Amino acid sequence: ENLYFQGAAYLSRIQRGGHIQPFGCTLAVADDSSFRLLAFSENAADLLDLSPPPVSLGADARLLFSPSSAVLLERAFAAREISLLNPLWIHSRVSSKPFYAILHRIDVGVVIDLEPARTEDPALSIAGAVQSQKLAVRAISRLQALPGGDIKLLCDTVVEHVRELTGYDRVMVYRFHEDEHGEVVAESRRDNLEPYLGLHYPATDIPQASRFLFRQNRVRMIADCHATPVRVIQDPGMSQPLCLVGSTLRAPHGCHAQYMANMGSIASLVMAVIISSAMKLWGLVVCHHTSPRCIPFPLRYACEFLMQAFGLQLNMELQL
Numbered sequence: 001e002n003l004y005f006q007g008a009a010y011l012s013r014i015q016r017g018g019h020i021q022p023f024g025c026t027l028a029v030a031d032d033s034s035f036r037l038l039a040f041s042e043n044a045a046d047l048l049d050l051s052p053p054p055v056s057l058g059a060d061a062r063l064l065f066s067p068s069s070a071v072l073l074e075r076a077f078a079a080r081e082i083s084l085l086n087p088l089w090i091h092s093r094v095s096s097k098p099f100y101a102i103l104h105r106i107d108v109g110v111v112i113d114l115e116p117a118r119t120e121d122p123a124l125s126i127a128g129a130v131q132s133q134k135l136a137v138r139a140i141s142r143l144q145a146l147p148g149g150d151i152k153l154l155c156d157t158v159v160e161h162v163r164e165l166t167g168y169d170r171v172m173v174y175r176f177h178e179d180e181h182g183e184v185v186a187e188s189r190r191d192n193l194e195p196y197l198g199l200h201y202p203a204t205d206i207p208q209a210s211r212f213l214f215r216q217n218r219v220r221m222i223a224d225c226h227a228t229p230v231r232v233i234q235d236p237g238m239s240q241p242l243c244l245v246g247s248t249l250r251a252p253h254g255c256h257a258q259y260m261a262n263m264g265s266i267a268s269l270v271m272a273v274i275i276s277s278a279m280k281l282w283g284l285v286v287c288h289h290t291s292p293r294c295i296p297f298p299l300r301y302a303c304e305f306l307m308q309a310f311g312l313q314l315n316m317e318l319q320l
């Protein structure tokens, strides 16, 4: 309504921008049991230690990974619901470098985001997975244990639990006003950082396109706003840029990358606060770091279900 004069501003370059963040790599793979590579980020061979090259259009994507990894991929692709197995713990074929693989389906096939695992030891990997999930359930029960009719205390508790879970320098709750401008209504930050609590920002800083995408893609991580985006090489038969809207590694729009650089938020993690209207974006939990940061997928998943629990409790206290 207030941003009506923008139309669908930015939506095409956010959905199909052609670039990923360099901390990981992306593969698009045929969804017909051939595992043919349809597209790959130009850094894939480098990140997989693999410089007919194994990373080339039409090659078998399974041959990038260890033989036991290929079996997990075959299972995940054939599963009734691909999201249930995310993330896969898989190894590159030649170097045995471990990755979390996050799979999703698009128009043309399956996208695989590969995020390097910053531990080889499987047991410490499991210990990280486990601790996060149990931290989210603990956070959720602590939100359940909260005296009702106090949205401010709910927001102040959320920011403390998310800051302990994620380790970001600054964690905020950003609430959208009626006129679509926002306000920082709760903050937990490193004590040598200037507070943003109580600050108001124009509606135009978060365009309708971005607000809309947060309904389907509820958690977005940016590892380094200064990182050079990586282009996607695609099969010449694809008539438009790959859909990256569901990718964990989608590069920020250059206007946002510059916004983050000007704010000194080198890294961010942004999560949707969704309530019933059938669903409304009430606000965001916005995490900033003053250095690069890329937390493992299991911690981001644990945040996502904490945020579902926050939305439901918030939606109860609002209808009440």
Ligand SMILES: *[C@H](C)[C@H]1/C(=C/c2[nH]c(/C=C3N=C(/C=C4\NC(=O)C(CC)=C4C)C(C)=C\3CCC(=O)O)c(CCC(=O)O)c2C)NC(=O)[C@@H]1C
Pocket: 010, 014, 172, 174, 182, 184, 196, 201, 204, 205, 206, 207, 210, 220, 221, 222, 251, 252, 253, 255, 256, 259, 263, 265, 268, 269, 270, 284, 286
């Ligand atoms: C470019 C001309 C204009 C513009 C575009 C733009 N913004 C976003 C998305 C976001 N903008 C913010 C804003 C804030 N972050 C903060 O820390 C604060 C203070 C609390 C504000 C107001 C946020 C949170 C997002 C979401 C980003 C994310 O997903 O992590 C986009 C979408 C970017 C994309 O790639 O998805 C775009 C295009 N921003 C401007 O300021 C210009 C007017």
